[PDB]
Design a protein around this ligand. Structure first.
Ligand code: 8IZ
Lengths: 119, 121
């Protein structure tokens, strides 16, 4: 099966338009069987995002203790399904932002396996 | 010089659209039979932006051992061109086969774009 680390890269990494989310959510298989309603893409190097696993330790939403917040803000894009969107014509609003990210980290190598939030 | 990116587009991109004679016409018109019959060549029938986006998708080892290859998460419409046994330069002859497959490309540069077609899977 796809590893959690690889799923994180597919869902959330774009090291790198109003139609950005429409193209990306499709290209990442996030519209295949249903429209994933909410998603964030991070526009930093893979190395910079993996380094978050060595930064500020914080609680995960689910109560676990292996979450980490980036010290620095990062360039991200929030994709959120519009009010009119109906599968299979998934439609998204693209919003660019610079924010801290919070990821859960696991494994060897110790890397992000889940996107918890942006703050 | 032709840039590596422009060369990838000439050799491997055909968004415009494949007949039984598609490869014979296309390998000739894209100058892939100029100095020899190029033995294997793939044309991708997706938008340039969709193919360019593969440089941020699944990182996989290249056939030559370099680490800068990327596999598309979704399948893409492609046409494979393979030289026939009867083919004799300069009258290069090809078998045309359509498929829907994940593509693997090598990417380089700033911007980070496709410069080589490695394989389909
Ligand atoms: C296996 N294969 C190979 C090729 C071409 O052959 C060269 C071999 O060095 C590559 O650089 C490609 O230009 C292709 O287009 N499609 C494909 O599936």
């Amino acid at each position: 099966k796809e590893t959690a680390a690889a799923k994180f890269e597919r869902q959330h990494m774009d090291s790198s338009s109003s139609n950005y989310c429409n193209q990306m959510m499709k290209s990442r298989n996030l519209t295949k069987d249903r429209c994933k309603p909410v998603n964030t893409f991070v526009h930093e190097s893979l190395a910079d995002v993996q380094a978050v696993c060595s930064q500020k330790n914080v609680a995960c939403k689910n109560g676990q203790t292996n979450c980490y917040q980036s010290y620095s803000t990062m360039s991200i894009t929030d994709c959120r399904e519009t009010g009119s969107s109906k599968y299979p014509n998934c439609a998204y609003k693209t919003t660019q932002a610079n924010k801290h990210i919070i990821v859960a980290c696991e494994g060897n190598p110790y890397v992000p396996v889940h996107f918890d939030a942006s703050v």
